[PDB]
Amino acid sequence: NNKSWMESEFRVYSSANNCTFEYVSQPFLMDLEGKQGNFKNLREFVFKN
Amino acid sequence: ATRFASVYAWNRKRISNCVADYSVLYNSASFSTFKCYGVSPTKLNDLCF
Ligand SMILES: *[C@@H]1O[C@H](CO)[C@@H](O)[C@H](O)[C@H]1NC(C)=O
Numbered sequence: 001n002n003k004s005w006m007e008s009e010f011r012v013y014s015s016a017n018n019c020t021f022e023y024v025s026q027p028f029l030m031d032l033e034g035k036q037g038n039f040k041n042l043r044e045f046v047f048k049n
Numbered sequence: 050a051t052r053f054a055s056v057y058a059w060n061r062k063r064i065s066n067c068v069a070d071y072s073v074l075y076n077s078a079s080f081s082t083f084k085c086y087g088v089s090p091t092k093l094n095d096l097c098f
């Protein structure tokens with residue numbers, strides 16, 4: 001009906017309590033429409049604590 | 050701000066991930082009581098946490 005792709009469900013954690021930190025970036029508009037063909041994005045990350 | 054919280058229900062706000070200025074704390078000498086324990090009252094702008 002609504003010709004668009006949008007996130008619907010967040011099923012990561014049931015609840016949170018005694019939290020410590022939270023940060024939210026500015027609003028954006030990413031393209032969630034399915035793309036067919038050879039890969040066009042490669043993202044590399046390194047995490048260390 | 051215009052309103053504060055109650056003594057028993059003191060409102061706690063977590064300050065972090067933001068650029069901080071402590072000059073206004075002592076520049077405006079409109080506070081009857083201003084006391085820092087374990088931290089220099091005047092050197093608030095020369096400390097990190
Ligand atoms: C389309 O968006 C409207 C507006 O929120 C919503 O009421 C409706 O349920 C949506 N339909 C579908 C199929 O997602």
Ligand SMILES: *[C@@H]1O[C@H](CO)[C@@H](O)[C@H](O)[C@H]1NC(C)=O
Nearest residue numbers: 006007008009010011024027
């Ligand atoms: C993040 O997405 C979830 C699920 O769509 C939504 O409930 C929540 O309000 C969103 N948060 C922000 C800051 O957009």
Ligand SMILES: *[C@@H]1O[C@H](CO)[C@@H](O)[C@H](O)[C@H]1NC(C)=O
Nearest residue numbers: 016017018019020021061063
């Ligand atoms: C939150 O967790 C920390 C880490 O164990 C603990 O020191 C603190 O007392 C907890 N706070 C509450 C309100 O449970």
